[PDB]
Each structure stands twice: as C-alpha cells, then as structure tokens.
Design a protein around this ligand. Structure first.
Ligand SMILES: NC(=O)c1ccc[n+]([C@@H]2O[C@H](COP(=O)([O-])OP(=O)(O)OC[C@H]3O[C@@H](n4cnc5c(N)ncnc54)[C@H](O)[C@@H]3O)[C@@H](O)[C@H]2O)c1
Ligand SMILES: NC(=O)c1ccc[n+]([C@@H]2O[C@H](COP(=O)([O-])OP(=O)(O)OC[C@H]3O[C@@H](n4cnc5c(N)ncnc54)[C@H](O)[C@@H]3O)[C@@H](O)[C@H]2O)c1
Ligand SMILES: O=c1ccn([C@@H]2O[C@H](COP(=O)(O)OP(=O)(O)O[C@H]3O[C@H](CS(=O)(=O)O)[C@@H](O)[C@H](O)[C@H]3O)[C@@H](O)[C@H]2O)c(=O)[nH]1
Ligand SMILES: O=c1ccn([C@@H]2O[C@H](COP(=O)(O)OP(=O)(O)O[C@H]3O[C@H](CS(=O)(=O)O)[C@@H](O)[C@H](O)[C@H]3O)[C@@H](O)[C@H]2O)c(=O)[nH]1
Lengths: 392, 392
C-alpha cells in the first residue's frame, strides 16, 4: 505494498511515522518543505539532539534496510507542486502532518497568526482537492488536535455528540472551542474536511491527538542519523518533554499558572501505531471518522510530580516553579475525554512508566550540554500579541 | 457622531447600510477594494439595474445631503492598507461586509475555493488585529451566516446551546455544519472572533443573517446614482430576487431539486435596521454576541408560490421548473431557527408582503430588457468542481 504519502515527514511525528510505515512494508514518500527547520534558525531554537538532514536520514534508512522512501521537497500550498507529487507517487493513503503546529508560534504576532491559518487551512484544502482530482479513493489520515474541543463542563466525545433538544434528537459535530490561532486552524481544517466527505465522497479520519512525549521509536534508534528531534524550547517544546529536559539541566519545572490544566497524552511510539491502525483500517467512502488519539490524561501538576519522582531516582533534586501563565486558558477545569475507537481497532498502548521517564531523563542528561537554557522560559504572551513582526 | 467603518461598503448590503448609517448621523467611511465589480467583468455578469461608480455614489450623497462618506480603496488582506485606514478614520464600530459571499463562486474550482477562504479568513483576522492594536474598544459587527448551522434535526439557537450530557450541564457554541466553502469560511470567522473576545477582550456581534431580498431602501431611492445592485445570475443571485426577475422575463422559476430547502429571509430594509441596532446597542468587552438575523422562514416551494401569485396580479403567467440541484444539501428537512434577540432590541420588521413583491416584480419588469437570460440557469456543480481555473 500500500502506498502512503507522509506530508510533514521530516517533522517530529512525521519522521517517526514514515520510518515505521516503511518498516511495516508500505511504499512511502515524504512531502515536506522543511520550513520547520527554518523556524529553528529564525527564532534561535535547536533540538536537544542533533538530527541529520532529510536527505541523509533517507539515505541511512536505505543503507540499513534497502528500502527507499521517496522525497518531494515543496510547499503544499503550491498546488502545482502538490499535484505533481500526487500524480508521481499515486498514494493510496495520505497522512497529513504538514502544518504549523505550535500554539505559541501562532501567537507571536499578526504575521505568524496569519501564516499559521493560511498555511494550515489552504494547505489542507489543496490536499483535499488533490485527492478529489487525482485519487478520489485515497484515504486522508489527518492530524487534528484534542485542543479543538477546549475544556467544556461535559464529557468530550470522539468528534460527535448525540443531543436531545426541545423534544428532538440528533447527532451533531462536537462543539469546538480552540484556545490559540493554531488550535483554531485545526478546527477550520476539520470542518472543511467533514464537508468534502459529504459533498465529494472523500474518506477521511481526523486524529485528534493529545500531547506527544518521548524521542525514541524502534526505527529511529537503529542509527544516529535516524534520530528524531526532541524540542524543549518554550515555542515548540511541549509539557512533558520540556519538564524532562528541565529536570536534567537543573532548571525548576515550569508550571504555568495553577497547573491544573489537564490534557490527554501519548508516547510517540503510540503515535506511529495509531496512524498505522488508521491506515490499515480505512474510513469508508463519504465517512469522516474522528478518533481521540491519546492514552492517558494528566494535569500539569501531575506531570511535575512524576518527573520529580523519576528525577529523584537519578539524583536530580528536581524543583518546581510557578510561572505567570503566558496563555489564556482554564487552569482548573473538568476533563473527561472519551478514547476507545483506537483501542477497539487493536491499539496496544505504552502507558507512561518509570522506565520511560528514566530513559527520557537519562537521554536529556546525556545531551544536557546542548541545552540552551535561555529558551526554556516562555516569552510569548497570548494577550500582548502585536502586529509588528518580532525578531527573537 | 459615532464613527463607523463599513468594510465592503460598495456591496449590496454594505452600500445600503453605509447610506442608512450616514443618514442616522453616524460619521461613516467605506473600505472596499471593489473586487466584487471585477468578478462581474470576469464571469460576464451584470446587475439588473445599472449602478454608479463608488466615487459618483458618494459624490451624489454629498450633493444631496451635504454629508461626506470617507472612502478608502484597498484590500483588507493588505494589513498596511487596513492599518492606515483604521488609524486615519479611528472607528468606534466596524461593520464587516467585506468578504466573498457567494456559495456558487466558492465552488467554481480550487482557485476560487482557496481565494474564498483565504480572503475571508485572513481579512477577518486582520480586522481583529487592527481593532486590538489601534482601537481595542472598537465594536466589531460581523456578518456571519445562518448557513453556519446547516439543517440539524433540532431547533437552531442564536449561537449557543445549553446541553446536559452524562449528568453535567454547560452552554456551548452551537454545532456548525456548513454546506459550501463560502459558508465554511464564515464558520471559521466566527470561531476566530469568539477566541479573540475571550483572549483579548474584543467586543463583537456576529450577525448570522438569512437570505436578503429587495433592492430599495429609503436612502438608495433618493437618486438614480444611489441605486443599489440587484443580482439575478446563478452565481451571485439569491432565491427570491432571482425568482422575481425570472417571473418578469417569462422564465420558469428555477426550483433546485425538491424545493423543500427552508431558510430564514429578510428585507434589505431590515438588514440596515438590524445593523444599526447592533451598533447602537454594542456588545460588552469580551462578549461575543450572536444574533440570528432574519424575519421569516420560507421554503423554496413557498417562495415559488408567492411569486407566482404576485406575478398573476401583473399578468406574468409565472411557471415553475425543477432543476437538477447543482448543490449537495437536504431538499426536505426540519427547520426551526430561533430569532428574538434583535426583536428584543427593538427591531420593527418589514415582513414579506404583496406590496413588496408587487414593487420588486414591477422593478424587474421595468429593467427586463437588461436581463441576460443566459446567466439564469446554474452551471456550477458542488460535486464536479475541479482544479483547473475556469473561464465562464
Ligand atoms: N507534537 C505534538 O505533541 C503533537 C500533538 C498532537 C498533534 N500533533 C500534530 O501532528 C502534526 C505534526 O506535528 P509535529 O510535532 O510533528 O510537527 P513538526 O513541526 O515537527 O512537523 C511538521 C512538518 O510539516 C512540515 N510542513 C509544515 N508546513 C508545511 C507545508 N506548507 N508544506 C510542506 N510541509 C510543511 C514542516 O517543515 C515539518 O517538517 C501537526 O498537525 C500537529 O499539530 C503533534
Ligand atoms: N446578500 C445576501 O443575501 C446576504 C445574506 C446573508 C449574509 N450576507 C453577508 O453580508 C456580507 C455582504 O454581502 P453582500 O451581498 O453585500 O456582498 P457583495 O459581494 O455585494 O459585497 C461585498 C463587498 O465586499 C468587498 N470586498 C470583498 N473582499 C474584500 C476585501 N478583501 N477587501 C476589501 N473589500 C472587499 C467587495 O468588493 C464588495 O463590494 C457578506 O458577509 C455576506 O455573506 C449577505
Ligand atoms: O512548560 C510548560 C508547557 C506547557 N504547559 C501547559 O501544558 C498544557 C499543554 O501545553 P503544551 O505546550 O504541551 O501543548 P499545546 O500547546 O496544547 O500543543 C501541543 O499539543 C497539542 C495537543 S492538544 O492541545 O490538541 O491536545 C497539539 O495539537 C499541538 O500541535 C502541540 O504543539 C497547556 O495548558 C500549557 O499552558 C505548562 O504548564 N508548562
Ligand atoms: O434559483 C435558485 C436559487 C437558490 N435555490 C435554493 O435556495 C436556497 C438558498 O440559496 P441562495 O442561493 O438564495 O442562498 P445561499 O447560497 O444560501 O447564500 C446567500 O444566503 C446566505 C444566507 S445563509 O445560507 O447563511 O442563511 C448568505 O450567507 C450568503 O452570503 C448569500 O449569498 C438553497 O437551498 C438553494 O439551493 C433554489 O432552489 N433556486
């Protein structure tokens, strides 16, 4: 074999997924403009671990396994490029990871908020049109976000909710409440895709994924040049990964506000597994499937405690600090998000364990010398966002 | 006064509104790039009635009343232009009509679907940033769309719905189900605005307006050069206006599919009244108000009957025809949309009457010679939409 086009395949989730699918014997190609690497240069950021170029990454995989991952370098917002890539590769499935995924980045200034929504929304529209025009039966596996749902006072369902209102019943799309221009762009994406499923017969699966943690997967650990990126800065870094790196360098864990913010989380190893499951068990024509993709819920404070305890076993004497929250969000809220669709399809989760934290912490300690502590504290305010293009 | 910036002020709803607000003694300016006029030239379309240039329109209003409506010609997607216009005028309220509003246009091809979403979503984001940066207390009166709600099997509320799910209760944004790339762009707009109200304290009112009908308003009838446009083509024309023009030229009424499609409608005279009411009674800081802006619900078949009966009194011998529906939508569905917020604020509606239909029909007959019958039948398919840029 089945042919899979991995848009955003040079990224954190995409690279791990591309290698996994190739190992599982799918014919794979990567479509990426590598703009994520440009963001690092422009903002002065750097991955914890050094990563190889996309060309060397692909070359190494071929040298080790003999398998060739095709590469198409370009911006999917450029339809000519996307169309040519689609016609050249002829994918049976498309996994779309190719979007600006940072909430902080989307809040830097007007230019970055506009770039985020244009890049994400238009890019996704182009993907839908390419599928419709060049391979209508192609299954779209889209990376959405648990953040689309926000933090309502009721249980969060997997994309749909059956409601009885004024004596009548119906199953409707779950109300969306995004808290950043980035999260909003995903809401827009999901609404756009749902429409094309009904109007054109497109088959798609929206993976509303929670926060991913970890850096190792069976494939990326086979050689140093296959190593994945591990972000710890306040722009692209996420909660758990950030805390582990902070613990390793002796920086107090950065708890934003009260720390009651609760979200779904999952090991990067489960990210690749879930995507493969979605590909192996495709949506039917005209069906818009929605899976809540995470394995466990944790509050920020809970993560802080787990990392502190794990760090103690390594003599890190982890400390915690309360950082005035740069974001506008509920710091204490109800949270009970449903997640059984993937489990029903055979998901065998890697729940957060002492072993994972021990491994991740030791990894951070190993490359502690490469950590730029100046990028640990957040400097992007949700409320103070302006129109002048900022230079970090 | 109070200063009002009318974005899209050269358009159908915008022009009538700009004149009305000026008459009501608000200081008014119009921000428009006049791209709507370019669409007419590009697609070979033309208004039923000849309209004057925006410059002559504004000049005539000044000659008649002595009042000056300031004009800023530019694309709001160009932030430099929008910022300069905002700083120059210093609006207390902004009414945003400046978007690509045709569902058929948004379905012509990939380029037009992408243009629709980019123009609308990015333009609206720029407006939000301009308000935040140059006049945070400025009230945004946004034109949304009843189409955002789709046609669910339950009552449609005014933006929000209180639901009890699994033993818990909460009031959430009403589920959105748009049926075109244009309607989808409005859903995106509304979600984006709601976020900025909470994050930045923006005050906004989303006017989810139904289908507008009519061509006359007290102000536009004061002189021929103030005349508003009346669209009847299958791209920009809407149901009732289209039927009246069809009846006048002896063309069978174009009922798409079964004709059970039900929507909310309102006289253009109520459009201007509702906008003024929203401006005179502004939303509070951080509040995202949502009003369902229409006065009565009608099914396509119901409109066909009303126009036939009205046409009979003028000896038009109106006929009806069933056109294979170019759109993907429910042709028989439940529809009970709530609309009381505007009435509670003092709306004095002009319900559809024999007098209105008689007047509108006679108007169409008056300019029947200018009707290009080749543009009456729809040629844009929701399902056959392609990637090649079309030339109509
Ligand atoms: N990282 C997480 O914790 C997490 C959690 C939930 C969902 N996801 C989702 O998974 C997807 C990938 O996330 P990630 O962490 O791997 O991101 P990333 O930034 O590491 O990877 C995204 C990749 O997409 C590429 N890209 C972006 N825009 C592109 C365009 N216009 N054309 C071609 N390529 C483009 C970038 O260059 C990059 O290589 C995103 O949708 C994201 O929101 C990630
Ligand atoms: N006409 C209806 O029946 C109806 C019904 C419900 C809601 N509305 C809404 O009211 C608004 C106006 O509708 P209309 O019928 O007057 O449309 P229209 O096309 O006659 O007017 C829109 C105006 O906006 C201007 N414009 C578009 N993009 C612009 C940009 N990037 N920068 C500056 N100016 C721009 C166009 O040139 C045009 O003059 C739309 O949001 C529409 O969806 C209209
Ligand atoms: O040092 C930190 C980092 C984060 N947080 C808090 O932890 C929560 C999660 O934040 P995060 O930065 O780890 O993740 P988020 O911004 O939500 O974004 C990431 O996780 C999202 C999953 S979700 O929100 O959709 O569930 C994906 O969509 C995004 O692409 C990905 O970047 C937030 O309340 C945040 O304020 C802290 O308290 N301290
Ligand atoms: O000759 C015609 C024209 C229309 N219809 C049907 O009548 C209904 C209304 O169509 P329309 O073209 O009059 O209006 P619509 O496309 O919904 O769009 C217009 O009305 C919308 C109000 S609403 O959908 O948001 O309620 C606004 O948002 C849009 O900007 C404006 O162009 C549809 O089911 C359509 O298929 C016919 O049967 N015959």
């Amino acid at each position: 074999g089945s042919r899979v086009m991995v848009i955003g395949g040079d990224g954190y989730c995409g690279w791990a997924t591309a290698l996994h699918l190739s190992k599982k014997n799918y014919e794979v190609c990567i479509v990426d403009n590598l703009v994520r690497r440009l963001f690092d240069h422009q903002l002065g950021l750097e991955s914890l671990t050094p990563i190889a170029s996309i060309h060397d990454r692909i070359s190494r995989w071929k040298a080790l396994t003999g398998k060739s991952i095709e590469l198409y370098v370009g911006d999917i917002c450029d339809f000519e490029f996307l169309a040519e890539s689609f016609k050249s590769f002829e994918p049976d499935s498309v996994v779309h990871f190719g979007e600006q995924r940072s909430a902080p980045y989307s809040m830097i200034d007007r230019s970055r908020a506009v770039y985020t929504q244009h890049n994400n929304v238009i890019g996704t529209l182009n993907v839908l049109f390419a599928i419709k025009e060049f391979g209508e039966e192609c299954h779209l596996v889209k990376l959405g976000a648990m953040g689309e749902y926000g933090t309502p006072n009721i249980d969060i369902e997997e994309g749909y909710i059956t409601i009885t209102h004024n004596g009548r019943t119906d199953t409707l799309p779950y109300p969306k409440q995004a808290s950043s221009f980035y999260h909003l762009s995903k809401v827009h994406d999901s609404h756009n895709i749902a429409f094309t499923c009904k109007a054109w017969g497109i088959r798609a699966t929206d993976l509303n994924q929670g926060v991913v943690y970890g850096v190792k997967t069976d494939e990326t650990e086979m050689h140093e040049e296959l190593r994945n990126r591990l972000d710890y800065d306040a722009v692209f870094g996420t909660a758990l990964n950030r805390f582990c790196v902070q613990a390793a360098v002796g920086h107090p864990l950065t708890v934003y506000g009260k720390g009651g913010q609760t979200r779904g989380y999952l090991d990067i190893r489960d990210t690749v597994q879930c995507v493969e499951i979605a590909i192996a068990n495709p949506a039917k024509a005209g069906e818009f499937r929605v899976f809540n993709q995470f394995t466990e819920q944790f509050s920020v404070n809970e993560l802080a405690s787990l990392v502190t305890k794990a760090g103690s076993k390594l003599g890190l004497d982890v400390k915690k600090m309360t950082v005035p929250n740069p974001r506008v969000e509920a710091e204490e809220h109800y949270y009970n998000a449903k997640h059984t669709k993937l489990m029903e399809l055979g998901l065998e989760p890697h729940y957060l364990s002492d072993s994972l934290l021990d491994s991740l912490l030791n990894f951070a300690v190993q490359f502690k010398d490469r950590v730029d502590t100046k990028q640990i504290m957040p400097s992007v305010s949700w409320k103070k966002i302006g129109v002048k293009t900022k230079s970090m």
